[PDB]
Amino acid sequence: TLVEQILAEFQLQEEDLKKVMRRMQKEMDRGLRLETHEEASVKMLPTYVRSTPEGSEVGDFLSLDLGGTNFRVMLVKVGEGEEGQWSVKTKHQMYSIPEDAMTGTAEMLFDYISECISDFLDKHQMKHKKLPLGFTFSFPVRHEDIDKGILLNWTKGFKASGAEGNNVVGLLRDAIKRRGDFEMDVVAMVNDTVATMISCYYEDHQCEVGMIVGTGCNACYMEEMQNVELVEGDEGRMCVNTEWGAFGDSGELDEFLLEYDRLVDESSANPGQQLYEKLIGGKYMGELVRLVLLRLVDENLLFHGEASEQLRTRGAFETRFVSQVESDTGDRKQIYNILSTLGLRPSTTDCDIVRRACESVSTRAAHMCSAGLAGVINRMRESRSEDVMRITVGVDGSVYKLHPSFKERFHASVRRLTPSCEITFIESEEGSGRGAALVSAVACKKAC
Ligand SMILES: Cc1csc(NC(=O)c2cc(Sc3nncn3C)ccc2N)n1
Ligand SMILES: OC[C@H]1O[C@H](O)[C@H](O)[C@@H](O)[C@@H]1O
Ligand code: NA
């Protein structure tokens, strides 16, 4: 019966979440203040995207989406909307990064990206058009401005020599010149959390928070300028990229971490970093599951103590498997097919145990995540007057969007933790592309 008590290790009581939430708030304040911003696990990075935008330019914009291996190039059209700009994706193409240039230097990487941009401009007879480019770039960047900032480090298993520490917008502009054909006017670079927030903002002006729960996990929110000590000026408001994925990197999370968490971290491309993200993100969820499964087969609780060759190979339990397992109608068919595909022959109870393990991980993910969002929303509550703070959160990510019950658990948990708040959740259409374009269109009012 060792089973349910092994899975019980994943539970988090209310008071646990509240604790995580209050710590998250502590680290966010720490990241915003000059004296601690340098050492803070939660970097709270200024994005230079500011409030009261208008006016905005209109017309076609080119949008780049890297974060990464399968990155997108698309063409967004922005125009004078009702109380802001409308926008829409009119053309698009995905490109797979070759694991070769992916491993090669940064200039190799951005060369391949420059090519793909030409590939795209050809296919659509735009090669000669010279457009403003919005760059969605889903990694930690310390910005000097909206069109300048350096890669702090790669996340999410990404890596490519000689990129960290360099101006990312700089690398791209270079690679474009090392091509000859087109001239792209690189206007804005934004985190995906930000682009998503921006997309949703024109749908709902109360949306002041952007959140991604896919491969990785992160959020952004509108801060009061006087709180952004790393940008000068107490007047106005600026979006901040928390990069909360790194929360826990100074040990804020030690009392919650499980063996499976330590295994996942140690064997990761970035051991010691992004620990909070590794509790939630789809880069890691399936693998947590795999490790739990293996621990069960070792206590002879599962598959009759016999793991298959595949189940023993790192990364074999894809996050989408977790999501299919929890979609099982209860005829175990879905669960059987996955497990079989992994070289296993599950009994009826094997399947039910595996479903249990999936629910335990994805439920912990949903709650861990709800603590951070609640921490952000409750921080923002401090700066609002009305009795009930009504606020909208824009969200994107496969885990949040596609996993059968993650979002329900998440919503309920966030609400428990955020009294005197009315939270509305919006999912973003093409939040990355249209988000980057919308921001470019406003940034163009000063550089175009
Ligand atoms: C310096 C600079 C460059 S681009 C820029 N502004 C934007 O792109 C932009 C910012 C927001 S943030 C905001 N304001 N009120 C509420 N919210 C969430 C909303 C829409 C936008 N198009 N500032
Ligand atoms: O893609 C979602 C998130 O993944 C990681 O946490 C990146 O560091 C962050 O910048 C990004 O927003
Ligand atoms: Na300031």
Swiss-Prot record:
Pathway(s) it belongs to: Carbohydrate metabolism; hexose metabolism; Carbohydrate degradation; glycolysis; D-glyceraldehyde 3-phosphate and glycerone phosphate from D-glucose: step 1/4
Main location: cytoplasm
Subcellular location: Cytoplasm; Nucleus; Mitochondrion
Effect after changing residue 266 to Q: In MODY2; benign
Organism of provenance: Homo sapiens
Effect of residue 30 to C: In PNDM1; decreased stability; decreased glucokinase activity; no effect on affinity for glucose
Summary of activators and inhibitors of this protein: Subject to allosteric regulation. Low glucose and high fructose-6-phosphate triggers association with the inhibitor GCKR followed by sequestration in the nucleus.
Outcome when changing residue 30 to H: In MODY2; decreased enzyme stability shown by thermostability assays; no effect on kinetic parameters for glucokinase activity in vitro
Annotated binding of ATP, by residue: 65-70, 215, 282-283, 319-323, 398-402
Annotated segments matching region Hexokinase small subdomain: 54-190
Catalysed reactions, semicolon-separated: a D-hexose + ATP = a D-hexose 6-phosphate + ADP + H(+); D-fructose + ATP = D-fructose 6-phosphate + ADP + H(+); D-glucose + ATP = D-glucose 6-phosphate + ADP + H(+); D-mannose + ATP = D-mannose 6-phosphate + ADP + H(+)
Result of changing residue 86 to C: In HHF3; increased glucokinase activity; increased affinity for glucose; increased affinity for ATP
Disease: Maturity-onset diabetes of the young 2: A form of diabetes that is characterized by an autosomal dominant mode of inheritance, onset in childhood or early adulthood (usually before 25 years of age), a primary defect in insulin secretion and frequent insulin-independence at the beginning of the disease. Hyperinsulinemic hypoglycemia, familial, 3: A form of hyperinsulinemic hypoglycemia, a clinically and genetically heterogeneous disorder characterized by inappropriate insulin secretion from the pancreatic beta-cells in the presence of low blood glucose levels. HHF3 clinical features include loss of consciousness due to hypoglycemia, hypoglycemic coma, mental retardation due to repeated episodes of hypoglycemia, and seizures. HHF3 inheritance is autosomal dominant.
Protein name: Hexokinase-4
Effect after changing residue 55 to D: In MODY2; likely benign; mildly increases glucokinase activity
Species classification: Eukaryota, Metazoa, Chordata, Craniata, Vertebrata
Effect of residue 213 to M: In MODY2; no effect on stability; decreased glucokinase activity; decreased affinity for glucose
Impact noted for substituting residue 27 to K: In PNDM1; decreased stability; decreased glucokinase activity; decreased affinity for glucose
Keywords tagged on the record: Allosteric enzyme, ATP-binding, Cytoplasm, Diabetes mellitus, Disease variant, Glycolysis, Kinase, Mitochondrion, Nucleotide-binding, Nucleus, Transferase
E.C. number(s) listed in UniProt: 2.7.1.1
Gene name per UniProt: GCK
Complex and partners: Monomer. Interacts with MIDN; the interaction occurs preferentially at low glucose levels and results in inhibition of hexokinase activity. Interacts with GCKR; leading to sequestration in the nucleus.
Documented effect of changing residue 59 to R: In MODY2 and PNDM1; decreased stability; no effect on glucokinase activity; no effect on affinity for glucose
InterPro entries the UniProt entry points to: ATPase_NBD, Hexokinase, Hexokinase_BS, Hexokinase_C, Hexokinase_N
Outcome reported for the amino acid change (mutating residue 147 to N): In MODY2; decreased glucokinase activity; decreased affinity for glucose
Result of altering residue 302 to F: In MODY2; uncertain significance
